[PDB]
Amino acid sequence: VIRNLIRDNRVVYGGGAAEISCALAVSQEADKCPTLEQYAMRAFADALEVIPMALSENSGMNPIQTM
Amino acid sequence: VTIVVNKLVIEEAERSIHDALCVIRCLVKKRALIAGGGAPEIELALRLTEYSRTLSGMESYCVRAFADAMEVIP
């Protein structure tokens, strides 16, 4: 954590905030790829949600509603 | 009003006139037309996925499945 901040002080908000924001960008950009890789890009969005959806599950909350 | 017009060729003609009346009845109740060949099913699948991003709760996962289901027709 210290070595990473020394190599680059730039950081992203944790607690699942980064994964949920990237999933929106990946979903919108999937519309611009007219090819069979489009279904994989949407799958990348849903796969990104599993990290934050797993945190709420381990804490004892409704995953999808909190997601 | 009555419409006077092989035994099989006349039967399909009655179906041809009934199906036309059904389509003509559709334009009456709904004065509009839409493209075929899976055109609305893609727009319905595309724009509903946009709404699911704005909603919250379980509706996003449910409305998204409603959108992906329309893609089976085309």
Resolution value (Å, 1 decimal): 3.3
Nearest to B68 by CA among A3, A9, A38, A21: A38
Query: What contacts B57, CB < 8 A, 6 or more positions away?
Result: A64, A65
Which secondary-structure segment (H or E) carries A37?
helix A37-48
In eight-state DSSP terms, residue B7 is H
Helices (H), chain B: 7-29, 39-54, 59-70
How far is the alpha carbon of B13 from chain A, nearest alpha carbon, in Å?
Answer: 44
**Which of chain A's residues have a Cβ under 8 Å away from the Cβ of B46?**
31
Exp. method: cryo-EM
Query: What contacts A16, CB < 8 A, 6 or more positions away?
Result: A51, A52, A55
Cα separation, A51 vs A61, whole angstroms: 14
Cβ of B53 and A27 within 8 Å?
yes
Residues in chain A: 67
Query: What contacts B22, CB < 8 A, 6 or more positions away?
Result: none
Which residues of B make up each annotated binding site for ADP? 37
Task: Choose the closest CB to B58 out of A24, A27, A64.
Answer: A64
**Quick check: B50 contacting A, CB < 8 Å?**
no
How far is the alpha carbon of B32 from chain A, nearest alpha carbon, in Å?
Answer: 28
Query: What contacts A38, CB < 8 A, 6 or more positions away?
Result: A30, A31
How far is the alpha carbon of B48 from chain A, nearest alpha carbon, in Å?
Answer: 13
- Residue burial A18-43, b: 16+ Cβ < 10 Å; e: rest: ebbeebeebbeebeeeeeeeeeebbe
**Quick check: B53 contacting A, CB < 8 Å?**
yes
For B48, the token pair is 């509903």
